[PDB]
Tab-separated table of C-alpha atoms in Angstrom:
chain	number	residue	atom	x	y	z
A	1	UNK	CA	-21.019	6.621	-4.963
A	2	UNK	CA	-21.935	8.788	-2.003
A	3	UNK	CA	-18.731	10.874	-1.272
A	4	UNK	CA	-16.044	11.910	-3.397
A	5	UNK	CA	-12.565	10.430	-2.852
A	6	UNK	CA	-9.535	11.779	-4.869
A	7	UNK	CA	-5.712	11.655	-4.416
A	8	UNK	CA	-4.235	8.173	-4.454
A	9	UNK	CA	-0.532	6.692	-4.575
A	10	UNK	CA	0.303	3.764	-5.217
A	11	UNK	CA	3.124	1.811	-4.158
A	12	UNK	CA	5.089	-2.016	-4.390
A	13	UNK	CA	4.394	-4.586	-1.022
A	14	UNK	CA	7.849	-4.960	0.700
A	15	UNK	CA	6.265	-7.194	3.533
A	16	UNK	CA	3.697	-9.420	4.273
A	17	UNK	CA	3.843	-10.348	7.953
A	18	UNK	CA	1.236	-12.570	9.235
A	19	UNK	CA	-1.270	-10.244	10.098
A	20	UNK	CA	-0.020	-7.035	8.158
A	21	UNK	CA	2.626	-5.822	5.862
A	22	UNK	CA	4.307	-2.927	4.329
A	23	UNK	CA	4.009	-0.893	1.065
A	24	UNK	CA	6.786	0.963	-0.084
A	25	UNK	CA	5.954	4.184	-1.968
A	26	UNK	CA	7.134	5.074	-5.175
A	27	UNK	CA	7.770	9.038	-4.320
A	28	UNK	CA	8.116	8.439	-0.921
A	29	UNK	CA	10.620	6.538	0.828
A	30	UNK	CA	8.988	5.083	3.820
A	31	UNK	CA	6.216	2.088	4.311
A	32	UNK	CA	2.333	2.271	4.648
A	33	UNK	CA	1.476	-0.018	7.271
A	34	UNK	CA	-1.953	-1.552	6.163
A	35	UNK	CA	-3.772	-3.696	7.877
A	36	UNK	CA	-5.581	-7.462	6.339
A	37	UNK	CA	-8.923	-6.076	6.707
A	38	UNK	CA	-9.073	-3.379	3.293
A	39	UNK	CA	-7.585	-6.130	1.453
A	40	UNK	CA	-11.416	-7.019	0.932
A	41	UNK	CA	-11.240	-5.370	-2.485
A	42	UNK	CA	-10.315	-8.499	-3.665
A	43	UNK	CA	-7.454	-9.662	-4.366
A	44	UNK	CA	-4.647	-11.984	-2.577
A	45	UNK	CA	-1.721	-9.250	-2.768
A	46	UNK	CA	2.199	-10.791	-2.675
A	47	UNK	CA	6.015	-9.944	-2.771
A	48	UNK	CA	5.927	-6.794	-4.675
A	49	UNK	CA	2.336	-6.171	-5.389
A	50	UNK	CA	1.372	-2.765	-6.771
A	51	UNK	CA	-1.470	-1.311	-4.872
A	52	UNK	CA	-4.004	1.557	-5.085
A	53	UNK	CA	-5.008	3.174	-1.834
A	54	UNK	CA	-6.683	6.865	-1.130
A	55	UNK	CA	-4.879	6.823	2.414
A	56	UNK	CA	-5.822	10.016	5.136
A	57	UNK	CA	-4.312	11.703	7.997
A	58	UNK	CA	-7.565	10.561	9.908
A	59	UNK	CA	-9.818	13.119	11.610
A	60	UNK	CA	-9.845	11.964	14.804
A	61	UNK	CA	-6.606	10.627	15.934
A	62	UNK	CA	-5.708	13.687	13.535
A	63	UNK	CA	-2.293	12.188	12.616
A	64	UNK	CA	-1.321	8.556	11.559
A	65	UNK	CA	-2.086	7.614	8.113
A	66	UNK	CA	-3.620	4.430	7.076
A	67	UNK	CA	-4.456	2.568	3.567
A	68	UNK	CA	-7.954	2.302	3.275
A	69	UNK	CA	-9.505	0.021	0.824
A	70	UNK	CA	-6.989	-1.669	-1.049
A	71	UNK	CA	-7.060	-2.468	-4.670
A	72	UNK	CA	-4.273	-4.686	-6.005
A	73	UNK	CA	-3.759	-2.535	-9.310
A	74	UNK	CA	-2.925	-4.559	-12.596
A	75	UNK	CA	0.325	-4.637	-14.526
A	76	UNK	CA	0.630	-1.804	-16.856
A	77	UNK	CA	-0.579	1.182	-14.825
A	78	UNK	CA	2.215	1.295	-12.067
A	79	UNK	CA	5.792	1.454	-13.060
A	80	UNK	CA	8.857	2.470	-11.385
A	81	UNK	CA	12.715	2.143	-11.584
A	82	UNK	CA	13.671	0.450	-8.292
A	83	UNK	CA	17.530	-0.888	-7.312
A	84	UNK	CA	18.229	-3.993	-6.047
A	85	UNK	CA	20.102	-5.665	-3.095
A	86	UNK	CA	22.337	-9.120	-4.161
A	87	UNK	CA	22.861	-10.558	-0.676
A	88	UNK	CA	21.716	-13.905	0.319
A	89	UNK	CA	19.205	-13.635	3.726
């Protein structure tokens, strides 16, 4: 409760790697690569986990933007018509 942080998107996990992962946007079309280390909100995210996340085009590196703090959101809040792609592997 020190500084005020406003603007967040949410978005469904499309990847999980060991080590990181990917969060596909639900306006945007493109990943947030997020690291395992603002997962400590708490919470063991999974295949198509919706996510809240302020995200910032850093001030330093000024460019690159990262997920900070991640809070696995709960079902009800996010919602989003997505399609779908039969093809085994």
């Amino acid at each position: 409760g020190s500084s005020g942080s406003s603007g967040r998107e949410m978005g469904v996990i499309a990847a999980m790697r060991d080590g990181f992962g990917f969060i596909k946007c639900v306006d945007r079309d493109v990943r947030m690569f997020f690291h395992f280390s603002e997962i400590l909100d708490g919470n063991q995210l999974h295949i198509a986990d919706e996510v809240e996340f302020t995200v910032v085009p850093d001030m330093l590196s000024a460019q690159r933007n990262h997920a900070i703090r991640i809070k696995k959101l709960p079902k009800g809040t996010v919602s989003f018509h997505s399609h779908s792609g039969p093809s085994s592997g």
